[PDB]
Amino acid sequence: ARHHHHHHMPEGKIIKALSGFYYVLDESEDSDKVIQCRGRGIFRKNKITPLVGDYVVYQAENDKEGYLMEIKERTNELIRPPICNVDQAVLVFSAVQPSFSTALLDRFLVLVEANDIQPIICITKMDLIEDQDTEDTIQAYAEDYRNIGYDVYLTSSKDQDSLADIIPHFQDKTTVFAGQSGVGKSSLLNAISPTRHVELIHTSGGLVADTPGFSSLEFTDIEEEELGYTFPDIREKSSSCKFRGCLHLKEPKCAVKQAVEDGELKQYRYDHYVEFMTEIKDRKPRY
Template structure:
């Protein structure tokens, strides 16, 4: 019998598929055709499978994907919580911008979640207001870990009927966020290494959990994210404040750096686009432009 469902966990060569109608989870393996075509099933994939008994099956086909993330390895993602720690380890705004560009390029709605706010002094919290305001003015939703309690209704509205991931560096608080969303499930967390200034990988596989009528993935953390698969001419499309001005510069292929009558540079001068965000754009533009074609990586 052939059934359809979504892969909710991948572990040790097995793919755990939740059948669409009954929501029963089958342990499946992929057919050899996936190896022959160099296709890897991902958590979040909608798949066809045949059952060999009431609990096991064989994957037969992967349905077309909306998108796919290699790091973290999840497909068909609608929304992502970008978990950014403001202390131990403190994430830089440029790294936040890098993650946002990555998510925007995949058509994934980002939600900025600032963790470890409770570790800040009163003065440091005041300084954080400007960072929060910057991203809210661009149009991003921002949550603080200290304010998550009582936001169930807002979270439910965001997550319902969506596949959601939590992304960010190791040790920034992704598992802690998931514990807040799923209080009955305790996800392992770890202290940040004092010598290296970064966290340990507490999540070793990717799995979808039922949260507020949607599916949320706890995923392994990673410290580096490649963006050189993005054509440099398209980079400004993944900065919402620049996208709003698309096509208004004097030159059609304006890089927003040296050209005259550039509306983006004018917006930076007037403060309508922040200098920090513009600097992030320039840095990423040159990284993409300088990448050697045969070394360019796929989206990671």
């Protein structure tokens, strides 16, 4: 028979943090159990605030609140919402209503990439396209981003609500939704179907944040030499640039610029790179 279950140091993930308690999901036993914990019974001197998404060691006894013992090193941390250890971001945009913008997509991609997160791309409202030229343009963009190496899912509004092709990605990951406010929120609600503080919702074998990420798109923490790494296409071509640390702006014998000339890198990707570079540089005085 089962006895003394509570005399070990189990591990779990913080899925909710509210009013002085931390709710820890523990999948490591036949049970799916959520344990209400205080952060205080050990974990100091160590003033670090626990965050939703933290991987923790905790202790808990029968019919008593638990206590966080140790917070594991964080792989990443978002500021708004305050969450950490995020594996993936589903970036949701509309094909029409409003018209799809590679500029907007590329900005979100940079932010996700710069936070050590894997982007997944979702273009919805495909059902609202009547013009064949509009359909062809969106299919071409989708193939472009697939060729860069992203997963790209084209969905109808009242259909994508099912999230059929996205759901498989949730398993054993922590995921956030971001992108356009309208479609991003509606897709997210669809995902987690059966200010407030963010929670992770346990669904389809993984965790999904109940608040959109990346609500502000400033590049404040990104430096000029770091930007190219967030464009996998530019990043890979940068190996062939003559000068080391080439920023792919006015340098001669730049492989990135040559690739754009040849059609090996999309013109719009490079155009956005240069635009974002300018924005980064404009933070500071120039000499």
